[PDB]
């Protein structure tokens, strides 16, 4: 998919799973440091992304997802084998 639609939905998801304001979400926003996600929020987020984009984010790959950009970069790469 073109990034625009992809970023639109991720933003909508992140704002739904963490209950922060949609417009306070930016490419460089850190999930744990800037958005205040805890252990359980992360699990819920990674799974929300896994269902919307129908991907699988292995625990190895989740270690490298710190920012929204990381989320987008991964989704775009590991959706097409």
Consult the annotation and say whether 19 binds a ligand. Answer: no
- Closest approach, Cβ 4 to ligand PNS, in A, equals 26
Binding mask 20-59 for a copy of itself (x = CB under 8 A): ----------x-xx---xxx--x----------------x
Quote the CA–CA distance of 40 and 75 in Å, as a whole number.
Answer: 21
Binding site for ligand PNS (CB under 6 A): 38-39, 42-43, 46, 59, 62-63
Quote the CA–CA distance of 77 and 62 in Å, as a whole number.
Answer: 14
- Closest approach, Cβ 14 to ligand PNS, in A, equals 14
In 3D, which of 4, 36, 41, 33 has the Cα closest to residue 21?
A: 36
Strand ranges, E, within 7-70 = none
Choose the catalytic residue: 8, 23, 38, 70: 38
Active site residue 38: yes
Consult the annotation and say whether 35 binds a ligand. Answer: no
**60, containing H or E segment:** helix 59-62
Point out the residues that are catalytic: 38
């Amino acid at each position: 998919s073109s990034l625009k639609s992809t970023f639109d939905d991720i933003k909508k998801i992140i704002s739904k799973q963490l209950s922060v304001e949609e417009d306070k979400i930016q490419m460089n926003s850190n999930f744990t440091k800037d958005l205040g996600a805890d252990s359980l929020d992360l699990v819920e987020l990674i799974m929300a992304l896994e269902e919307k984009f129908n991907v699988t984010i292995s625990d190895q790959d989740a270690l490298k997802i710190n920012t929204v950009q990381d989320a987008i970069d991964y989704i775009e790469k590991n959706n097409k084998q």
